[PDB]
Design a binder for this molecule. Structure first.
Ligand SMILES: C/C=C(\C)[C@H]1C=C[C@H]2C[C@@H](C)C[C@@H](C)[C@@H]2[C@H]1/C(O)=C1\C(=O)N[C@@H](C[C@](C)(O)C(=O)O)C1=O
Length: 378
């Protein structure tokens, strides 16, 4: 069994060391810093779920973050209920272990455990990526499980370029789209609250995988996470805008599906003020929305949502445009000291409208966005 076990107080490398390479056509779920963790690296395993009607949403990111040592191991959890309740906590643990069962380190049954030597948070992913299980055992905070049943959407990167969300930085989706179940109990500051999404309620989610050998905050001014479903469309986005020292490089790893077929493999992020028909490659344009309905974000950008315009370089030259409008404020935290330069990290449940450009299509759905703002820097 391949084992990456990070524990104690000597798990950090002395210098930034390289991580292992991208494995083509793989979830890449086994850690890229297997034995020692680079002090500037971050590895992320993300699992989420939301109700098909936006009545509930849940996301957890399992982190190994070298830069925030000693507290490098963390399951960051966010939960939202349609009645307005939100719940956000980190489970900071001293042990993070990931194992992959089988001879092939890129295609084995993976189990991750963020745990004390009481807090247990664990994930389990089938070797064929068909299913996941996430289990929380954190008495007095969160207990229960999340599961994914993959819908089998094409998703895996076939090359280093397809795994990138920016040069040398990786974010992609080992499971693009899954039927999600949730059966969780949260302790609200002693009161308990349930979140239950059964296997036939149309709740959906995915599994995202990321790793970076550099601290990403020093490289970006903007990060946008999206997962949304509207009618036949499923869309997932990780878009980065760099710092001004790289001239606001616009990068993305995104995908649009229609009835489970990938219709935009969007590894190109377009200038937000374009709305043209050029398409030499599949692409997505992310544009902050300020007009119309939607809760206004609180920090640097007072946006009511985001427009996502996907383009296909396929022969039909289709474009799809969706408006993702802030429906429920999920989380909101500063990413800098307050004031005129202040920035933030905001999560929303979004209402989704739109469809194929040039058609009568007008679909309706729900999703989540994570909208991160970072300082422009000296
Ligand atoms: C929901 C997903 C995101 C908000 C990601 C957004 C952009 C990513 C950039 C990428 C390169 C690294 C990765 C770690 C970031 C990810 C990130 O910033 C996360 C994430 O995965 N979970 C949250 C955790 C959160 C809200 O900050 C918290 O609960 O404290 C969070 O802020």
């Amino acid at each position: 069994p391949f084992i990456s076990l990070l524990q104690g107080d000597q798990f950090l490398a002395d210098t930034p060391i390289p991580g292992s390479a991208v494995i083509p056509n793989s979830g890449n779920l086994f850690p890229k810093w297997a034995d020692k963790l680079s002090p500037t690296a971050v590895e992320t395993w993300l699992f989420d779920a939301m109700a098909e009607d936006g009545s509930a949403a849940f996301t957890v990111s399992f982190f190994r973050d070298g830069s925030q040592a000693p507290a490098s191991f963390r399951a960051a959890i966010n939960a939202a209920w349609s009645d307005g309740t939100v719940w956000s906590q980190h489970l900071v643990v001293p042990v993070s272990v990931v194992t992959s069962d089988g001879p092939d380190v890129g295609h084995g049954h993976v189990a991750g455990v963020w745990r004390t030597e009481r807090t247990t948070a664990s994930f389990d992913v089938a070797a064929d990526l068909s299913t996941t299980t996430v289990v929380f055992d954190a008495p007095g905070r969160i207990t229960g499980s999340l599961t994914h049943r993959s819908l089998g959407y094409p998703t895996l990167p076939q090359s280093d370029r397809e795994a990138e969300v920016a040069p040398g930085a990786y974010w992609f989706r080992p499971i693009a789209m899954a039927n999600a179940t949730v059966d969780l109990t949260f302790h609200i500051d002693k009161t308990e609250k349930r979140m239950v999404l059964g296997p036939e309620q149309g709740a959906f989610g995915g599994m995202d995988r990321s790793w970076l050998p550099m601290v990403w905050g020093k490289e970006a001014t903007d990060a946008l996470f999206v997962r949304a479903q509207a009618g036949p469309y499923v869309m997932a986005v990780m878009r980065l805008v760099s710092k001004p020292h790289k001239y606001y490089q616009n990068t993305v790893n995104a995908a649009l599906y229609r009835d489970g077929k990938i219709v935009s493999n969007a590894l190109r992020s377009l200038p937000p003020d374009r709305r043209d028909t050029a398409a030499t490659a599949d692409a997505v344009r992310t544009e902050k929305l300020y007009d119309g309905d939607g809760l206004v974000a609180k920090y640097r950008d007072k946006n009511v949502g985001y427009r996502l315009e996907f383009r296909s370089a396929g022969p039909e030259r289709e474009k799809w445009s969706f408006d993702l409008r802030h429906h429920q404020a999920w989380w909101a935290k500063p990413t800098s000291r307050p004031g005129p330069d202040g920035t933030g990290n905001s999560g929303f449940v979004v209402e989704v409208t739109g469809g194929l450009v040039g058609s009568e299509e007008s679909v309706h759905g729900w999703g989540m966005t994570g909208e991160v703002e970072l300082s422009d820097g000296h």
